[PDB]
Amino acid sequence: MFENITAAPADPILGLADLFRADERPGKINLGIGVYKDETGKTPVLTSVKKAEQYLLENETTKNYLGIDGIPEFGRCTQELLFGKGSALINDKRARTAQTPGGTGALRVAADFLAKNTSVKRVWVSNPSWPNHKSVFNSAGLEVREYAYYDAENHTLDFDALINSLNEAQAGDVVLFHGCCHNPTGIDPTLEQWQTLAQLSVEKGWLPLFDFAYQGFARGLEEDAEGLRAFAAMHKELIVASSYSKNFGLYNERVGACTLVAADSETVDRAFSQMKAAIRANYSNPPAHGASVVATILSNDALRAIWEQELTDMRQRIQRMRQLFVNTLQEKGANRDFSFIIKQNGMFSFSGLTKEQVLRLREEFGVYAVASGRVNVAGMTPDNMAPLCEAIVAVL
Amino acid sequence: MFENITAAPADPILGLADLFRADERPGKINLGIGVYKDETGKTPVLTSVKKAEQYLLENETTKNYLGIDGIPEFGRCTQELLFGKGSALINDKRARTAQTPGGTGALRVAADFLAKNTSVKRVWVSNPSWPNHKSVFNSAGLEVREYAYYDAENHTLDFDALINSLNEAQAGDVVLFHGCCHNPTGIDPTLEQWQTLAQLSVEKGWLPLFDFAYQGFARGLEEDAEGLRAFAAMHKELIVASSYSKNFGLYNERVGACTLVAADSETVDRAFSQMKAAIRANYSNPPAHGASVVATILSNDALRAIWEQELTDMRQRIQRMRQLFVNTLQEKGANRDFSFIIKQNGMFSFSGLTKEQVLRLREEFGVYAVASGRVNVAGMTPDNMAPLCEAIVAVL
Numbered sequence A, B: 001m002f003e004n005i006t007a008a009p010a011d012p013i014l015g016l017a018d019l020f021r022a023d024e025r026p027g028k029i030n031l032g033i034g035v036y037k038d039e040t041g042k043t044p045v046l047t048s049v050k051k052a053e054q055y056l057l058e059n060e061t062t063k064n065y066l067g068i069d070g071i072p073e074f075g076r077c078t079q080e081l082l083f084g085k086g087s088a089l090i091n092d093k094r095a096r097t098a099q100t101p102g103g104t105g106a107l108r109v110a111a112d113f114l115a116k117n118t119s120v121k122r123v124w125v126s127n128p129s130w131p132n133h134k135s136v137f138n139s140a141g142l143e144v145r146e147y148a149y150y151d152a153e154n155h156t157l158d159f160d161a162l163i164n165s166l167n168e169a170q171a172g173d174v175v176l177f178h179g180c181c182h183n184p185t186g187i188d189p190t191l192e193q194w195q196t197l198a199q200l201s202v203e204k205g206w207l208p209l210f211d212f213a214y215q216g217f218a219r220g221l222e223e224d225a226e227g228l229r230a231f232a233a234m235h236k237e238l239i240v241a242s243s244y245s246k247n248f249g250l251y252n253e254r255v256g257a258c259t260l261v262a263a264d265s266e267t268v269d270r271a272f273s274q275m276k277a278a279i280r281a282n283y284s285n286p287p288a289h290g291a292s293v294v295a296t297i298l299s300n301d302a303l304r305a306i307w308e309q310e311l312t313d314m315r316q317r318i319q320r321m322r323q324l325f326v327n328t329l330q331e332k333g334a335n336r337d338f339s340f341i342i343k344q345n346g347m348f349s350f351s352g353l354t355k356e357q358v359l360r361l362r363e364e365f366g367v368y369a370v371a372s373g374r375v376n377v378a379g380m381t382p383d384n385m386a387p388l389c390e391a392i393v394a395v396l
Ligand SMILES: Cc1ncc(COP(=O)(O)O)c(/C=N/C(CCC(=O)O)C(=O)O)c1O
Pocket: A013, A014, A032, A033, A034, A035, A101, A102, A103, A104, A105, A130, A132, A178, A183, A211, A213, A243, A244, A245, A251, A255, A256, B283, B284
């Protein structure tokens, strides 16, 4: 049965972990996978998370199954983060949330739900985007088409090209938007651009699907949700796939949410029952530990204050690394303008390196980035910055 | 987009939790969902698990992503449980294991892997089986056909009907076997019947898929894997979807494994790369907490001894409830032979109640079972046994 199976191609991102660690030389520097590092080059457990875990250890009395949609408090807290306390969507009970294994899990549940219960056949994704978007949607039987996004000359959002691209999208197509911290470009729509896009998607009959993996890493929790909320104010229906992997540092505990919004309570409840059916036939019900940590923190004033400051600390350290990166590149070498790196949002910079320059960085210098030229600024430290920048200057 | 979606039908099992708890009367008795209860009617966290969780709390330094296939130690420990220490499958490196979110997750990963990478179109499942089998395989685009299994007159395995049923299976079809503790009948093949089936599946060209959710609940860890190992000794290829939900009491942490076996190391590695691709496009990588607990326990002599005794305690309490059930039914009423309940394996008894008798039990008496007549013996206690048996006798 298996003797004729062809090997899968290497994953453009996760496969870097394989190449790394297999690399035996001491000075190697990992700027690949999007995981936060502190100033010592480690990815620690958040202190708020350790405190929540101690509370769960001391107070959990059962591991009995959650409902298919997970912990109710987790869903309520998620909807408040997305839409705002006092939101009309929440008051009118227009939103239902399923706790999922990660943001990836939420994207797949959305895709399965859409493929089986609607007329959706196509998802529009930005060029460039996260490489696993195409994989998730294709796996559900949906085709993926690309829209223009990035002006590489000016390092801006090519808004006119984006709009003209999406003219080929038909009513009933899904359009995927990154909520904030675009992966890989770090360039987000302005509020006015979000507002224009919200209006256009209504008029064109697109179903918005938000991928919201970095809330809090651009400007702040409320600020980063402005685009989503502009869409929520205009649309009867949308889907949000959100992740707590980065902003709680809970990567391996698989903590995400799929939030379904419809015109009214009766409709969203009926539609959500089919989302739950899609979950039941996938992994049955979701993993409690990570989501319980998130719910415990978000619903407690003390823990939430600790966590919000830890998230602020992460955001500010990345911003400090952006500036140090630009300054150190000017030292040690070029003689080219990298000021655009300072304005980018999130953990990545899309640095202008070619595929071959990235290969050379890996092979010659032990500096690891993604072939797209994406580098993880959150992986930079005061200690590794000089060798990193010396390496980049060497490859031009 | 959503205004025309039809509501999903109620889940035959998990939907009981909804009907329960919504039921406001004090004397209600839950014999539905397959979760262990102790003598006090609670589903506690195992002590071995609490100890492992304290160790993780004290020693975990990161939540950085696991590999797509999860914790390496978890996979090694899983393969030893399935195949035995010193197994040829392990020595020849013919098996690869992915840590998954639950046994359900492992079944779905198997199904997706098979649908996309092989010529499999059909899965054969026993009549009766777990209702979610059909849902999982259909969701991957595989059709499900049923084979005969149960002689209800003699409460035995109808082996001749099983064999004649499977004559309609073609080479290249998948045949699903429950490893031990058949859900819902509690009737397993004898070792000699397993050995016959292993030989027959080789000659017929079936791909065996084992669902192994209850290892340790029939006779013991090694004993319960005899059937699987008989198949392993005869087949070049098979798949095992196993769960630690029940035998570690880790239901809501979603701890399972999908184990792929091929003729040699080169083949299983090539095939497993496509299993990892199927996972990446689903939930990306698996939840660490539950699987880390399992790995921590299985790989430590002290913790594993505590856990093995806790599992023995659970198995023996269920056996004591089987006897108390049969004895108490004879008291309080019938006048019918229930001795077959004593010989059944696992947490369920398939009691001979009709759909309407089960409805009456729920509506009139607040006793909750599945419409198939399946009752959770592990939900019976010395304290709830008399009202339970009085209710059953009342409906005949
Ligand atoms: C836009 C976007 N959507 C979803 C995800 C996945 O989040 P989780 O499934 O919660 O780990 C991510 C995580 N991205 C990573 C982390 C590793 C990965 O999954 O690729 C990266 O680009 O390096 C993301 O950037």
